[PDB]
Subunit: 139 residues, 3 copies
């Protein structure tokens, strides 16, 4: 199981169908009255908290990518894609960058990125060698 | 298996060796349009049909990313990477954005993006908790 | 296991905790003192050799994405993300594009991208179908 800890109950990611690859992470601007909206100007970035901390199982990791709706807004994750290790315990942040020409305003709890949980090879299970075994593709 | 449905036979993804991570998806502008080349200006985007609809096995999903040759052309997917759920049944689209400084032209049936099919954890197998466990 | 061939010993990817999803690929500019620093101006790109060639097991592949810290530097992989097939035997390259407004400089052997090794479905295990099930 993925264990999920929420800063506020409304940070709960949007769960899709049984077949969904991912769950939608939402902006969390806080609970104060002024937390209703935040704006990202063209060429600027904003570190957005999701209010979601996760315990991903050992052997898996979290991939954070934009929702397709982010594409129309010309927003991207500044570091392209978030990689959430299974030992990470803080809340997931989305550092969103405005590569378009118009200012983008976001609502509190708006769905912005997908969290997909995938398996990975153990990064300690490697061996340094002097030559690798050749293949037709090679290069 | 990956079930592949083609709008036109020339939409067939380019499948490489047994060891290839992904298959190459192609632009689809129609059978034989007069405008077989479409230009994308700097700062502009173009929604491109691949002509490819897939059924991906349950427990897996499709990741759509540019081919490496798009890097030199300064084209990205507007939403960075496509996420194709295993219950998606339309054709895959590539919304390509020109982030560079010069016009780029795409050709009908040109290979543009890779479709890699990857496993994912069930998004329903979660539990909300009050506190997370520290790490072993 | 993953087999790794390094052009120079200092190219060794940064290995993290046992839980780490990936290992950090480093810039490899050479063995020079002339190789200490490179600059990438806004709107420009630099093809960066990692000095790292890998033999990834069959059934798996390598995904190369920026480190989190590249986001603050407004550097991206020009082709968004690297896809390393299990039969690729050259060294991994990072073609880094400066999409921001400020100058960036990178040091030799500085950690830049994450390499994550993940399974992929066999692209030969497909059927061409007349019409799909909805």
């Amino acid at each position: 199981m993925i264990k999920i800890k929420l800063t506020h109950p409304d940070c709960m990611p949007k769960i899709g169908s049984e077949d969904a690859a991912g769950m939608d992470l939402r902006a969390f601007f806080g609970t104060n009255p002024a937390a209703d909206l935040r704006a990202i100007a063209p060429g600027k970035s904003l570190m957005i908290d999701t209010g979601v901390a996760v315990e991903i199982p050992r052997g898996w990791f979290g991939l954070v990518v934009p929702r397709s709706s982010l594409g129309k807004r010309h927003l991207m994750i500044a570091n392209t894609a978030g990689v959430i290790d299974s030992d990470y315990r803080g809340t997931i942040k989305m550092n969103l960058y405005n590569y378009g020409s118009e200012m983008q305003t976001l609502e509190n709890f708006e769905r912005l990125c997908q969290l997909v949980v995938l398996p990975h090879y153990s990064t300690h299970n490697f061996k340094i060698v002097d030559e690798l075994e050749e293949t037709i593709r090679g290069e």
